[PDB]
Amino acid sequence: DIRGCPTLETPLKLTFTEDIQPRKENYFYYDGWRGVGQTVNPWSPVLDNHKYAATEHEIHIYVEFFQTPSNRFADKNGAYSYIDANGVMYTNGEYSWEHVPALGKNIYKVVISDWNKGQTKSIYLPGRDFKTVEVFHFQNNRPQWDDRNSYENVKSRINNNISKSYSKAKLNEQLSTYVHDDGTDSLFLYQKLSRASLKESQINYYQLRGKFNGVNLGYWAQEYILFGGEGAEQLKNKIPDMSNYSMEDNGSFKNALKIESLDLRLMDNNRMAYGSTGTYIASFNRTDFSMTPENLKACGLD
Amino acid sequence: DIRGCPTLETPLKLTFTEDIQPRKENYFYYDGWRGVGQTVNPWSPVLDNHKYAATEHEIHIYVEFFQTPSNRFADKNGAYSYIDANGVMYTNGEYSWEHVPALGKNIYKVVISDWNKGQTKSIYLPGRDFKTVEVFHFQNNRPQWDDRNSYENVKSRINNNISKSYSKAKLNEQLSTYVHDDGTDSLFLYQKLSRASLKESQINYYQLRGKFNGVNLGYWAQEYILFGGEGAEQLKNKIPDMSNYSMEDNGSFKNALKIESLDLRLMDNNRMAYGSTGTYIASFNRTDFSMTPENLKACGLD
């Protein structure tokens, strides 16, 4: 018996942070979140920006457990939840979970909305002993937006339609002004956390990065989320020159009990193709509980 | 093995809330926290108020454990703490604990300051398995204020000097204007939580209520914290007519694991002695985690 270690009962947080600083090009400022603007402080959009740019962003989280969620009590602000006899989940504070039995037994859904400039969105998972967590990141003013609640249609686009890779030749193309739409999905990011087993000591993650709303000024600005995953923030103000750019991230967090939170940060990066194509980073990192070497060792987390 | 119940590892919160609404008397408004004012919205003090009234309030908490605090990790915002080899406690966020070995082994101190109108102060205890928690509530512009860090002198006043009871005849006395000071202590409230045993399932509490700064306008307004303890809020706008008024509160919270937070609220009550003496309530209540009857029973907390 060793007391005081983090356990599967200890809550795990998910954070989502908007951190896109607008990029000057000569002239106007590009910003994947709100389009293109003529001035920066304060923000002032180009003439026809409203036709193209997003004004709303949403995070939909689907959690699947191996069994009924095990926690037996709820707190004031939502760090702890429980389910009743019928499988309805009770959570207090800003967020509540919808039981979605149609998708499967032990699956729950939350929608975080009003995600604006500079904001960090935070939510506790109703259990650390999950099987799967899927996150959909949706942006406004795109044709799939009205249909964002269809889990199946979104998954279909993820599996069958969204590019897993972009060539350098593609990133260097100029879409002609005369094309009216650029084809970018409302879905701009998909995250999947998975654990192979109930008492499993690691968390696997996957991401499928997409694009932010394109804006057609007198040409076409297209906005690719070109890099992501752990430590991707260290690549800010760098675009390595290679022939293909992967839109997928893959990795594993060992010693997951040591993790306080899994953090997504969306940030700006250099522009390519003379300002015609923007690049962005979707970094996904862990912040750990602070622990001494001797407590790490004692809790088997070194 | 039953999973999902609240344990001694689950953090326990302490809350402190200022909720004194000023009372009109004909005319000016009395407010135990900031004195006497000529107008209310916004606040505007009487001529000589600064001579008498508090402008600062502080909460000093001393926690004693049965053994070294058992938690082995620290989080971002301070819900969890740990100690190192030398007994220094590590906590992140707004508050940190000072190790005070001079007072005893396993004793820690925190000072919460800047406690202003309407504010709730919240802090997690570094352990639920404590032996003792003592709270000192200090107010400004009183002669014991400079000495508020002397644990021993404060305890001496608590044991030897602060009245445990006030008579009705006393509450109905008018101190003459010609007396310059009313004698009220900087210490206006003392709380003691105690547990008789490491794995003990209840929390005992005690309070010694005092007075808020008196103000001498053309007479003497004196400010007694006349009621307190659990459910004392239900006595708002009531002063029961009896011959003595106890300044002590005593009670017990059974099933302490069910408690999310122990809540102190300071509130105004009717004035006595034709407005010369104010009364206030220091209610001390539990807010529980929400739990179904069937989870209460399963966790042995019904």
UniProtKB/TrEMBL annotation, chains A, B:
<keyword id="KW-0479">Metal-binding</keyword>
<dbReference type="Pfam" id="PF21874">
    <property type="entry name" value="CofJ"/>
</dbReference>
<protein>
    <submittedName>
        <fullName>CofJ</fullName>
    </submittedName>
</protein>
<dbReference type="GO" id="GO:0046872">
    <property type="term" value="F:metal ion binding"/>
</dbReference>
<feature type="disulfide bond">
    <location>
        <begin position="5"/>
        <end position="299"/>
    </location>
</feature>
<dbReference type="InterPro" id="IPR054068">
    <property type="entry name" value="CofJ"/>
</dbReference>
<feature type="binding site">
    <location>
        <position position="114"/>
    </location>
    <ligand>
        <name>Ca(2+)</name>
    </ligand>
</feature>
<keyword id="KW-0106">Calcium</keyword>
<keyword id="KW-0732">Signal</keyword>
